[PDB]
């Protein structure tokens, strides 16, 4: 598990593009790197337009709804029960009610006859993509059907009007159920001559974060609009839930504090509670409902901890697959218990409780493809590569366990990657870099917060507690971390951490929150090697032995000791050993390079005149020294190409 983790330094971009990004966006090289990796290049990519995505079927549904409203038809909004489904349902229910629609909600064939008597138009939120047979509402008695969902569409769309992103050719946005609900309300507003329903973007944003959709393009735009409307929401229940959790406008707070409370209600059978919170305009009742979700959340956490405690100490080792059975375990919390086991384990995880099953997988193992490998054993099932679910008679557990364990063995051990943006800059530059990274927010599925690589010997190390937690400094910057089993740092450490702005007592401190920490190891990254870092003393020996060598015109102080000493001086393109850097590229040259220690060459070590693209050259220089000291051919070679260009 803690041996199947790889650290990769992210590639450097072409310097002409790098500079293009720095200029537009107006930022330094570190932030430009992150921006370039996430695809942001014009000032336009940071604030995409929140516009009406032209989904396929959207206009017809909008027309169909206009008709429903004018003709006073009765509408039933049938939504999914997770946060995305509930916020989407609230969007449509509040939205349509505001326009004089006769509309009510409904949240989960045996119910089809109820839907029939109670409704003229049937609106599904984040569901119904493969509910064909329910074609009776369409057939047997004239009930109009509108389907809005974003779950994997079957081989053929179902009856009634369907509004699905993955059914719109081209289109590369990935709106969720709440997002689609939001677009549909928008389309209806266009038809009626009304302005965009921007006040519903907070509800849309919540659902969007909850369903872990990619935070880019439209999704990114939508969330920025919504995160900002939350503090003064038009929905007192959402504003009150957000304050209860100390919301400060950050997407991470939604994903981890707001949506979980809504989901807890649902997973515990009290989903109407969460829905009502989103629909009431009475603050008193809203206040009370927030207490109720707080109690449901606290309950879900309690059960989740008990289950985790019973299960984690089990079938984990190096078992290709983790298949555990907990008979009396609550079905509503096993999904999160699987994820926590999966993370602490880097192995697919299968849980079964009260005849229901959940799967959390990763790497080359498709969660749903494992289940398929043992499908005749299940009563029902379905999912994707990372998450899947099923029902099964617990009697078939051993058969199931073996099947899926055998299936996972058909693959290589999963390996977790940690993506490094770059070396962390000198402490003096941390503030500006942090402010420049700021425009990347909101962080999330789309774009994760960037990590930096700090490297050195830990000083002023001080524990804070009686284990794990500690603090220390690496080359002038304070780093906080949870020493992963051992405490006491090796003589030298490598850290992958978040650059933090820690407010305390009215003053700010910029330091690193380690997400991972370890004894130096081989780093992934760089381009195809051509320059191989060679230690200075080793290089001078060979030079003295008479090897064909190269010493650049700069620092003729060294080029002198060479003449005096009689080195077989040669031009860089033909000598296989360099004691310094040539001014212009020399490729097609598999060579060995040395800088020194006192070497004038080693003066890629002095600072400059900051602020401008001087900060660029400095990042390149820091890199060269790093790759040189770590004897990393790829990173050195890559850093050397960028060095050639930042000097042209």
Domains of the chain and any CATH numbers: 1-46+414-525 (2.40.50.460), 47-297 (3.90.1640.30), 298-413 (3.10.310.30), 526-648 (3.40.50.12810)
Task: Give the 3-state secondary structure of residue 208.
Answer: helix
CB 145 within 8 A of CB 112: no
C-alpha distances out from residue 198 to 56, 177, 185, 203, 205, Å: 22, 17, 10, 10, 11
Instruction: Give the residue among 301, 322, 304 at the shortest CA–CA distance from 313.
Output: 322
Tokens (6 digits) for 532: 């191989």
Nearest to 628 by CA among 596, 587, 598: 596
Residue 638, judged by CB atoms within 10 A of its CB (0-12, 13-18, 19+), counts as buried
Determine whether 566 is exposed, middle or buried from the number of CB atoms within 10 Å of its CB (0-12, 13-18, 19+).
Answer: exposed
- Asked if 172 and 158 touch (Cβ cutoff 8 Å), the reply is no
151 assigned to a ligand binding site: no
DSSP-based three-state secondary structure for 530: coil
What gap in Å lies between CA 27 and CA 34, rounded to an integer?
Answer: 11
Torsion of CA 498, 504, 509, 512, to 10 degrees: -20
Say what the resolution is, in angstroms: 2.5
Is 102 annotated to bind a ligand? Reply is no
150 annotated as belonging to a binding site for a ligand: yes
Token duo for residue 463: 């524990």
Q: How was this structure determined?
A: X-ray
Tell me if 84 is assigned to a ligand binding site: yes
Identify whether the C-beta of residue 647 lies closer than 8 Å to the C-beta of residue 584.
no
On whether the CB atoms of residues 360 and 386 are closer than 8 A, the answer is yes
Q: Long-range CB contacts (< 8 A, 24+ apart) of 584-591? A: 584/644, 585/641, 585/644, 587/530, 589/530, 590/529, 590/530, 590/532, 591/530, 591/531, 591/532
Sole residue written with tokens 């001086």:
569
Name, in order, each residue with C-beta under 8 angstroms of 190's C-beta and a sequence gap of 6 or more: 52, 62
Please tell me whether 316 is known to bind a ligand: no
Q: Which residues contact 320 (CB under 8 A, 6 or more apart)?
A: 347, 405, 408, 409, 411, 413
Residue with tokens 């916020």: 87
Phi, psi of 351 (to 5 degrees): -120, 145
Q: Is 80 annotated as a binding residue?
A: yes
């Amino acid at each position: 598990m803690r041996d199947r983790v790889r650290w990769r330094v992210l590639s450097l971009p072409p310097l002409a593009q790098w500079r293009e990004v720095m200029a537009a966006l107006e930022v330094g090289p570190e932030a430009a790197l992150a921006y370039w990796h996430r695809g942001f290049r014009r000032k336009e990519d940071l604030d995409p337009p929140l516009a009406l995505l032209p989904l396929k079927g959207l206009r017809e549904a909008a027309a169909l709804l206009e008709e429903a409203l004018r003709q006073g038809k009765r509408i039933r909004v049938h939504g999914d029960y997770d946060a995305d489904g509930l916020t989407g349902t609230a969007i449509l229910v509040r939205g349509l009610a505001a326009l004089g629609a006769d509309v009510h909600p409904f949240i989960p064939m045996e119910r089809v006859p109820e839907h029939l008597e109670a409704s003229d138009l049937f609106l599904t939120v984040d569901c119904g993509i493969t509910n064909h047979a329910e074609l009776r509402e369409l057939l047997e008695n004239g009930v109009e059907v509108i389907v809005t969902d974003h779950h994997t569409p079957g081989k053929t769309p179902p009856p009634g009007l369907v509004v699905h992103p993955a059914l719109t050719p081209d289109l590369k946005e990935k709106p969720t159920g709440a997002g689609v609900a939001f677009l549909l309300l928008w389309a209806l507003h266009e038809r009626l001559g009304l302005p965009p329903p921007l006040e519903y973007a907070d509800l849309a944003a919540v659902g969007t974060i909850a369903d872990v959709a990619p935070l880019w393009g439209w999704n990114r735009a939508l969330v920025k609009e919504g995160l900002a409307r939350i503090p003064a929401s038009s929905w007192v229940g959402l504003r009150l839930l957000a304050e209860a959790v100390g919301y400060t406008g950050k997407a991470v707070e939604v994903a981890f504090r707001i949506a979980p409370r809504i989901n807890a209600a649902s997973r515990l059978g009290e989903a109407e509670k969460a829905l009502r919170l989103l629909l009431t305009d009475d603050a008193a009742e809203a206040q009370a409902l927030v207490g109720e979700l707080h109690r449901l959340n606290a309950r879900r956490q309690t059960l989740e901890e008990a289950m985790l405690r019973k299960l984690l100490p089990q079938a984990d080792p190096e078992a290709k697959a983790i298949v555990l059975l907990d008979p009396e375990g609550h079905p509503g919390v096993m999904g999160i218990v699987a994820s926590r086991i999966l993370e602490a384990t880097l192995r697919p995880v299968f849980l079964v409780a009260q005849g229901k099953g959940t799967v959390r997988s990763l790497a080359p193992i498709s969660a749903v493809e494992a289940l398929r490998s043992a499908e005749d054993l299940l009563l029902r099932y379905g999912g994707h590569k990372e998450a899947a679910g099923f029902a099964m008679d617990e009697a078939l557990f051993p058969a199931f366990k073996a099947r899926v364990e055998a299936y996972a063995a058909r693959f290589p051990d999963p390996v977790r990657e940690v993506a490094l943006l770059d070396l962390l800059p000198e402490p003096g530059l941390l503030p500006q870099v942090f402010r420049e990274l700021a425009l990347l927010e909101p962080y999330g599925e789309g774009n994760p917060e960037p990590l930096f690589l700090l490297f050195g010997a830990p000083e002023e190390a001080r524990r804070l507690g009686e284990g794990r937690h500690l603090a220390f400094r690496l080359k002038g910057v304070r780093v906080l971390a949870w020493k992963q089993g051992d405490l006491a740092l090796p003589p030298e450490v490598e850290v992958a951490g978040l650059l933090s702005e820690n407010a305390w007592n009215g003053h700010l401190a910029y330091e690193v929150q380690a997400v991972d920490l370890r004894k130096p190891e081989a780093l992934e990254g760089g381009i195809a090697p051509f320059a191989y870092p060679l230690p200075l003393l080793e290089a001078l020996a060979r030079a003295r032995l008479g090897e064909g060598v190269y010493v650049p015109e700069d620092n003729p102080e060294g080029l002198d000791y060479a003449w005096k000493a009689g080195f077989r001086l040669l031009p860089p393109e033909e000598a296989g050993l360099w004691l310094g850097l040539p001014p212009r590229p020399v490729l097609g040259r598999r060579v060995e390079v040395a800088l020194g220690r006192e070497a004038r060459a080693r003066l890629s070590a002095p600072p400059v005149l900051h602020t401008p693209e001087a900060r660029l050259k400095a990042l390149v220089h820091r890199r060269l020294l790093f790759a040189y000291e770590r004897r990393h051919p790829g990173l050195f070679s890559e850093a050397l190409l960028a060095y050639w260009e930042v000097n042209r």
